[PDB]
Amino acid sequence: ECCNPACGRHYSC
């Protein structure tokens, strides 16, 4: 979840 793969859609964590 954590910026996966790299905060593309600015994922949570």
UniProtKB/Swiss-Prot annotation:
Species this chain originates from: Conus geographus (Geography cone)
Location in or out of the cell: Secreted
GO molecular function, one term: ion channel regulator activity
Annotated keywords: Acetylcholine receptor inhibiting toxin, Amidation, Disulfide bond, Ion channel impairing toxin, Neurotoxin, Postsynaptic neurotoxin, Secreted, Toxin
Protein name in UniProt: Alpha-conotoxin GIA
Family designation: Belongs to the conotoxin A superfamily.
Domain statement: The cysteine framework is I (CC-C-C). Alpha3/5 pattern.
Primary subcellular site in the record, as a coarse category: secreted
Summary of the function given for this chain in its UniProt record: Alpha-conotoxins act on postsynaptic membranes, they bind to the nicotinic acetylcholine receptors (nAChR) and thus inhibit them.
Disulfide-bonded cysteines: C2-C7, C3-C13
One Gene Ontology CC term in the entry: extracellular region
Tissue: Expressed by the venom duct.
